[PDB]
Amino acid sequence: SLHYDSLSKVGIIKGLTYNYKIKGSPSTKLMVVKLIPNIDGVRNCTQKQFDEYKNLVKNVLEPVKLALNAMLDNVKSGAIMAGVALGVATAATVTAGIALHRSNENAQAIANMKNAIQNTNEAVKQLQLANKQTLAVIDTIRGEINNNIIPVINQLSCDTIGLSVGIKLTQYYSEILTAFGPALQNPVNTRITIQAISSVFNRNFDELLKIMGYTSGDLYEILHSGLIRGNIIDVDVEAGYIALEIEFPNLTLVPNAVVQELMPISYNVDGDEWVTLVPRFVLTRTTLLSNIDTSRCTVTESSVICDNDYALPMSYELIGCLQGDTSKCAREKVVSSYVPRFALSDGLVYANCLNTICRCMDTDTPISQSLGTTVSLLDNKKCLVYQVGDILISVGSYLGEGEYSADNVELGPPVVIDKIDIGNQLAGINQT
Amino acid sequence: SLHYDSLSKVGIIKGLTYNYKIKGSPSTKLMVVKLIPNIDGVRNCTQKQFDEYKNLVKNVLEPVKLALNAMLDNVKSGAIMAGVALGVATAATVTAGIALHRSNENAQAIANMKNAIQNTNEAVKQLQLANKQTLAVIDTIRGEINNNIIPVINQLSCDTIGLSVGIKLTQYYSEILTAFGPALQNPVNTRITIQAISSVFNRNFDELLKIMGYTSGDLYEILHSGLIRGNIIDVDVEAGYIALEIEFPNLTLVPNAVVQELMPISYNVDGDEWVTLVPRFVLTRTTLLSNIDTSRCTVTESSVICDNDYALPMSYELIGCLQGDTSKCAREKVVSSYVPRFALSDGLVYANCLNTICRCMDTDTPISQSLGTTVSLLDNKKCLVYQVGDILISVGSYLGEGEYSADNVELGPPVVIDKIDIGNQLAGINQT
Amino acid sequence: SLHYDSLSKVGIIKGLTYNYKIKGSPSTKLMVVKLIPNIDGVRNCTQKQFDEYKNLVKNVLEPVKLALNAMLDNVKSGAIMAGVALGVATAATVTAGIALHRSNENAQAIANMKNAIQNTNEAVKQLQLANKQTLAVIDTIRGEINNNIIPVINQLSCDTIGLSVGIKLTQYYSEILTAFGPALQNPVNTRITIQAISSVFNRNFDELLKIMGYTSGDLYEILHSGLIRGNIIDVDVEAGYIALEIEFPNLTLVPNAVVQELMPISYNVDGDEWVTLVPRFVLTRTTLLSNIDTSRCTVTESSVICDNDYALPMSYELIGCLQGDTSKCAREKVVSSYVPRFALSDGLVYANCLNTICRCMDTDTPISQSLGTTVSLLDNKKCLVYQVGDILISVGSYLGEGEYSADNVELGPPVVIDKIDIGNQLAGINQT
């Protein structure tokens, strides 16, 4: 439970409040990415280039089929994993293996549609499966032929058509190696985001989502957070395609979990300028404080959205600091020319008026701050419009038992923190 | 003030000297990015796809217009911010809000040109505003229609034209969501680099700069450093466009500020190989040393260019080390097979001749180093061409009071530094 | 030498074993990237735009030619570097300078083919040099003209052809500045990966490799690891091209070097849930342990592939921990809702049955764990199929002197580790 009045006196001002969300239950859609295109219309001119290409595709997929079959043979049917056959695995790996087995029904439904997939002549098509599920099938290369070669085909000789298609087949191959590289090497454990899958399809993830029945504008939270992901459930070596299953997860709101932002400003210590060291975000669960590493999460207007729960333990001293004992708040000296010197909270302005400019516009007078005063509070008790630095701002009233003051503030120890500095410091401590 | 003679004896060799620059005053140009294209020529074939598209654009921009109006209503007219209405903000946020108000004059000048923007039929066009400012207007989609559909339109049926344009409209939409995503969610505080804006325009930032009156080759320092940035000043929901203001800042040379590079090499300690731990870059201001985090700056041939002043405090022990007391310089043991074992400074070579190969080519003799000697200096007093490792090099003369030696060098404490290692070490220290 | 039985008792389970590889000897191929295209077929319509373009290219390359000549003049002929003329350099810089001199023979062979390069009319061409080496020559722009303008040229007026080509020339220029930016500023020391070079050629690295005589599928280890790189050996300012030399290195298997993965799980301490802090990867050389920073390496199915040898020293306490003294293993408390609670190793399952669900399926009974027990081992001595969490798994037999137990496990000190937390903690330690 954060204590805001004692924190503001060491320059820590209450910022925005966000709620906390984590990935919830799954929902899936099926997709096929074709590696071997339908080249009807250019077959006689491109015969040489196309046969070379097909052989390369086969060599890429054969090792993938072996990896997928190796895992399927370790699961029998809930489903039981053969621990001895698998030998070594993480809990996540074992779970992925079981999931692959469960998805085999969809893989078979897709395989039985092989002819419909092969005979598709449009870059994007939707097929129906025997189990009433839909399948999104894409062949980027066919699109490029339909748009760039066919409309002008009567102007091109076969040598030109052959060379032109060969370059297209080749650049597509490079896009596959880049987007699915890791997934082809480890098809059981690797997941691919929708924005990465779309890099094979000219980067058009909006089209892929539309086929699967979604509007991009309605998926902002899971799309932007990178939570729409797929995995390889099957491959067909001779047909030349990869079967993916794509997840569109729900989000779970975590009860009694609040993420609070803190806004540090500089403060005065007998003529010197200092800043207090606290984490930007603090996670509170009912009553307890913990650390939240938001560099691994997406922060939105109202929510912090994480894939999993990333709460980390907070040190004893930091909890003591945040709960109101300022003698435990480590501070660092400011040496650079800029640092935030004011902030707005609940309509009031907190500022270091010894390092920035504070004036009352109603009276055209300067605002003083004694050297023993750490921060100054600007409210509407005496003046409505203040000049703070290069801006003018109107403020509200102060709520409290009496006039705000920061005349006798207990400060924590000074620190210098860096990788090299800690090395030198800790060595000095143990050497002495 | 760095002491180079005592530092070279622990393997720290003086490297290149750079000056220091930070962002200076702004200069701006106006731009409009059209989301709804001019489709004259295909209107009858694309009617269905185009109407769906326009509705999606409207839904994307409406929330942006609300965010922009919400901030404008908090500023009245210098301009005064309503702190109570805003409630909670950083100093940066308040400044951004005031800036938005100031840019409203340009937003109105652009709005009054709405018909000229809508009736543009070229991918890139320059318009004149009533206030004698120019406006750069782009519509990437129109370019694609002019280049890929119109020249072959007599070969295409309407079903084909409809589908072909639909895919283009859709992929453009995806590029907008990726490039301006964060900016549409927070249009007041988010800034976009020119190389990111250009990702909507086929990645052609040179064309965008040319229209705005600049040559890319003359903007290397601010272009490469990521300092050319824009922000959203207005949107037009029904017209389907975003109005941006793009900054082309001047750079400020910081007086008496010098950034000095240090080049660590290994050295000998009684048969073991050690390296001293110092920061690669040290910032000096007149006489004082501080840390500079160059991972956040662009380092060029002669300058270190930072957006803001990022100087950080340096620890007491590290200052003592760098100023000549080598007993304060922490060292780490070398366990890997490679480490720099020599360096060139002021025409002279410093090397660890117990771990690498040092020979005099003039006499074809080996160069000895006693076990108590930390580093050896190779100069032209005795030999002109030296073999150092696998290279041959000519050297200059040594400037000093007498022969260089490193026979009695006081060394600092040994350390091992990592995240896990510090955890274990600090725990051991407090537990004991 | 890792001690696995005592480590499993604090939740550290043996994971996968990888071998260790580093970059070996070089092999090279030559390439030319043309900046000034062959525009035969559109010369009369594009005259204005083309002349402006050529002037811009000249201005970009002139400074590069000066940097290259400045270094060549410091090397005479093994080759000898002029240390005085160079002044200040790292060992790496001096080596790069010597290498540039050695590559000058190839630069001359390329220059003598200038007319063959200029008269090439296909996007990708292979030329023969007088020294029997091949040269890969690319001109992306020519490809775009051959594919998008010529087939429809009778439908386009000159104004249209002029504008259309101008946009293509301009976007190409932007791609060059992005891909070779750093290389043009520092042509002696900067290296470019093949996937970055290919970003000038529509991202088609498979085509570039094919011309140079390679199959992408056979280069997975060096291609994916980023070890296929080139450097600028020459430029021709008037002709408008950059000459590159591209390296295709062999890999060296490091003898007696093994990289071992560790898999941490949670464990019980009197009702609390804790996890032990160890590095994920440990490098062993014959008998010695060291740290390996794999974030700088590519991890493949069987190998860890690094550019250079990145072994780092390991602390005394961590070695003691890993070699069997568990009182030296620092631990951290779990506060988040998820943590791995089991793992599979050598067919056996290790689990924390106080925090997850453990049951025997053969008898349909729960598996107990006393509060004083740290971890539980699930083997086939009593039950074949276990339920662990939400999965079912079959297990093998335990190899040892008797029944596995973890009743009296000595634990190391508790820690909280973060950047801020260490700052506060170390300050408290020195202040007290």
Ligand SMILES: *[C@@H]1O[C@H](CO)[C@@H](O[C@@H]2O[C@H](CO)[C@@H](O[C@@H]3O[C@H](CO)[C@@H](O)[C@H](O)[C@@H]3O)[C@H](O)[C@H]2NC(C)=O)[C@H](O)[C@H]1NC(C)=O
């Ligand atoms: C652990 O605590 C000790 C004692 O405070 C630290 O040693 C002292 O550190 C200060 C800087 O914080 C040194 O500053 C100098 O003090 C003298 C006063 O004699 C003043 O004239 C100088 O201008 C400067 O301010 C002080 O010399 C130094 N004391 C000694 C005996 O060396 C120590 O650095 C702390 N350890 C860590 C890792 O922080």
Ligand SMILES: *[C@@H]1O[C@H](CO)[C@@H](O[C@@H]2O[C@H](CO)[C@@H](O[C@@H]3O[C@H](CO)[C@@H](O)[C@H](O)[C@@H]3O)[C@H](O)[C@H]2NC(C)=O)[C@H](O)[C@H]1NC(C)=O
């Ligand atoms: C703080 O200082 C103490 C005392 O120097 C450190 O304890 C000692 O650390 C060394 C390694 O630096 C251990 O190495 C061993 O020393 C014995 C000599 O008895 C030698 O035969 C071994 O081959 C090895 O070199 C030494 O055992 C250990 N001393 C004790 C009593 O355990 C301590 O590690 C330092 N703390 C930190 C965080 O650095």
Ligand SMILES: *[C@@H]1O[C@H](CO)[C@@H](O[C@@H]2O[C@H](CO)[C@@H](O[C@@H]3O[C@H](CO)[C@@H](O)[C@H](O)[C@@H]3O)[C@H](O)[C@H]2NC(C)=O)[C@H](O)[C@H]1NC(C)=O
């Ligand atoms: C270095 O060691 C000392 C001594 O263990 C640490 O001080 C103590 O730290 C613990 C937390 O680890 C504090 O926890 C509290 O203990 C009281 C028992 O009196 C209990 O009732 C509370 O609920 C809570 O568990 C303990 O108060 C504190 N001791 C004192 C005198 O303040 C110190 O934090 C360690 N330093 C570092 C950097 O770890």
Ligand SMILES: *[C@@H]1O[C@H](CO)[C@@H](O)[C@H](O)[C@H]1NC(C)=O
């Ligand atoms: C290739 O096949 C198409 C479709 O039947 C035909 O129109 C074209 O003339 C054929 N080209 C050659 C060289 O046979």
Ligand SMILES: *[C@@H]1O[C@H](CO)[C@@H](O)[C@H](O)[C@H]1NC(C)=O
């Ligand atoms: C569409 O409009 C254009 C321009 O007037 C015309 O040439 C074309 O024939 C029209 N197509 C149809 C299907 O009406």
Ligand SMILES: *[C@@H]1O[C@H](CO)[C@@H](O)[C@H](O)[C@H]1NC(C)=O
């Ligand atoms: C440009 O040159 C080509 C090739 O000789 C010719 O066919 C075309 O008509 C010329 N165009 C003009 C405007 O002279």
